[PDB]
Design a protein around this ligand. Structure first.
Ligand code: NA
Ligand code: NA
Length: 260
């Protein structure tokens, strides 16, 4: 019985954070290879009772994109998603894209306070916001859109998704996020609360991958049409339409556009 991979917790997990892989027949896992660059020590791999899940801490960043390969007693299987799709990152605040203006913070995690680990600099939206507040903290940034050598111009927007890593300290009630691109606010995603692509829940106290259809923030038919808006704007805006004051602490990194 061959091993099978059904899902991976993130395509770009933060170094020092837990990677979880779900699937079947993870029996006597003898190797987990990351992007043909390094192996996870077998002793550092945790396997569930029913052999349907493995997890491990990512010890270092791959330098190139690739896939995860899992060897079990039944054979070897490769994850279908591209792992560490570095070429798909549009904004990381460390040389891909840049912050232009906004009330927000930028942090390099220090191992002692949230978000504890980071891949370099991340965006912070943190602090206390009054009830019914429609302009609070935000970042207006310039993205570096994915090259058409990676995503051809004729790919439908319907076939693409926006992914990013997010850390939420504690759940909150009231505050929401807007994500907008190319100053097309009519097409923006509004009222968004970060939820995990892996669990469907707002995970707290750890990084999660968040994913939305690119059509939820882009109105154009194809990727080329989107590029021809001739704007590198990407904006992340926090407000609080709730009836109570709230304090939140949310971090973002590695915005990326990938194929569904
Ligand atoms: Na970063
Ligand atoms: Na352009």
């Amino acid at each position: 019985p061959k091993p099978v991979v059904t899902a991976v917790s993130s395509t770009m997990p933060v170094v020092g954070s837990t990677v979880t892989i779900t699937g079947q027949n993870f029996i006597e896992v003898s190797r987990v290879n990351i992007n043909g660059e390094f192996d996870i020590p077998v002793g550092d791999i945790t396997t569930s009772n029913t052999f349907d899940e493995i997890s491990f801490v990512l010890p270092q960043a791959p330098t190139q994109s690739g896939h995860i390969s899992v060897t079990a007693i039944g054979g070897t299987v490769e994850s279908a998603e591209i792992f560490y799709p570095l070429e798909n990152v549009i904004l990381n605040y460390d040389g891909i894209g840049s912050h232009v203006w906004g009330d927000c913070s930028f942090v390099v995690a220090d191992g002692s306070s949230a978000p504890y680990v980071s891949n370099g600099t991340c965006l912070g939206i943190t602090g206390t916001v009054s009830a019914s507040n429609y302009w609070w903290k935000q970042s207006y940034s310039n993205a570096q859109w994915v090259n058409t050598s990676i995503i051809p111009g004729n790919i439908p927007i319907d076939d693409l998704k926006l992914q990013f890593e997010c850390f939420v300290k504690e759940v909150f009630t009231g505050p929401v996020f807007q994500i907008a691109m190319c100053e097309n606010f009519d097409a923006a995603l509004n009222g968004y609360v970060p939820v995990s692509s892996f669990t469907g829940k707002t995970e707290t106290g750890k990084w999660m991958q968040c994913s939305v259809s690119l059509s939820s923030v882009v109105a154009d038919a194809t990727y080329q049409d989107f590029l021809n808006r001739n704007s590198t704007h990407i904006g992340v805006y926090a407000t609080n339409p709730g009836s109570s004051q709230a304090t939140i602490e949310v971090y973002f990194d590695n915005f990326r556009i990938v194929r569904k």
